[PDB]
Amino acid sequence: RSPWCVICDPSVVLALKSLEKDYLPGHLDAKHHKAMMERVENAVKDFQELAYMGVVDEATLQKGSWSLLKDLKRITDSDVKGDLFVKELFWMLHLQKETFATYVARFQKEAYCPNKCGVMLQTLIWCKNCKKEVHACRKSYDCGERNVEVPQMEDMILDCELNWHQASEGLTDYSFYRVWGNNTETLVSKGKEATLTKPMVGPEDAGSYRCELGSVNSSPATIINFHVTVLP
């Protein structure tokens, strides 16, 4: 037993209050109001159409809610009353739920934790209590090696950016290290630059490099290792 996530939207809940207070007096017997609304509130507090994780993003919530409110207004503007009204309404809610189920399923397959490696932090809304918090999407410790060969005397670009970094929350700085054969390291840059440029490369610039994208949290969000070869 879980709610239809759409009540997490304030405009939706207010539209439902407005339906009860503004629309029902003029369009339905007073006797029927309380039962009607208990009936509506049941339709909304249970969502049977859905592996559902109980979460949604703001976009998905908005899409559903917009759809719902748009159709709901269609009904109220039509000025329909009695049986007609009751049955149209619940029939609408049913179909809306099926539509929303789709938005959810799409969200789970395409927008929930899209990173393919590392750790992405993303804000979700928990449907069971409308609470909105940041979730960690952990896919893998590493983001893998990059093998790079550079013509001598040309510029070396090491790219630490991934598809999803723009979207992730809680990211700080891209730190770049040189990794020496003697088991030590040196920090060479640290900033909002997702790349490292070393210009006009010489043989001495070959070897191991590492990127770490920092997080507001205690550990890095992306780690990428580069192995650099210089063509003499």
Binding site: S2, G54, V55, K131, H135, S218
Partner: protein, 203 residues
């Protein structure tokens, strides 16, 4: 006289290091044990995965947990996997751990932060529908707030982890109970607790 046999050791379970030693790097919540750990980097990383390969037990069985709740469970794992100060509570089932006394704050805050999250049973040690390779709620078991199935902090500490932990009435810095997590800055408050219990002076 002092139980030094029982100090600075790791249990024999499948993931654990045979002996404790420092690590350069541990993931997030297991960082406090850097100095001297029974977990590898890989173990520490695996502790934070959804359906951790460490146990193939799903926490999301009633849907995704609130992050604050998840954090507690992960810390529990970090502690179990990484602590070199559990000797006194090690026992065979090839070993496990029984009635490690968690300080009252640890159990209370854990309970507090999981109230809003949802589960379907009060005894996680077994009785699950296991059909997918991973546990799911058995037929007829309702998903409800944690405070329903774990009315007290004690219930939570003790039953989720099959009596690996005991809810101590003792509070932090008593010298008589362990923290499942602690700030690296502050130094490890559990070392002296282990020593005390190893000794003939406490059981």
């Amino acid at each position: 006289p002092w139980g030094d046999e029982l100090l600075n050791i790791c249990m024999n379970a499948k993931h654990h290091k045979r002996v404790p030693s420092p690590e350069d790097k541990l993931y997030e919540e297991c960082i406090p044990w850097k100095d001297n750990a029974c977990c590898t980097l890989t173990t520490s990383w695996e502790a934070h995965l959804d359906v951790s390969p460490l146990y193939n037990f799903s926490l999301f069985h009633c849907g995704l947990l609130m992050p604050g709740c998840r954090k507690h469970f992960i810390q529990a794992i970090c502690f179990y996997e990484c602590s070199p100060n559990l000797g006194p509570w090690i026992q065979p089932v090839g070993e496990r751990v029984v009635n490690v006394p968690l300080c009252q704050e640890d159990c209370e805050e854990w309970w507090e932060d999981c109230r809003m999250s949802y589960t379907c049973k009060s005894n996680w040690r077994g009785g699950w529908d296991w059909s997918q390779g991973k546990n799911r709620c058995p037929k007829g078991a309702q998903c409800l707030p944690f405070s329903h199935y774990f009315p007290t902090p004690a219930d939570l500490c003790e039953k989720t982890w099959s009596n690996s932990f005991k809810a101590s009435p003792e509070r932090r810095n008593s010298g008589r109970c362990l923290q499942k997590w602690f700030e690296p800055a502050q130094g490890n408050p559990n070392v002296a607790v282990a020593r005390l219990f190893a000794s003939e002076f406490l059981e």
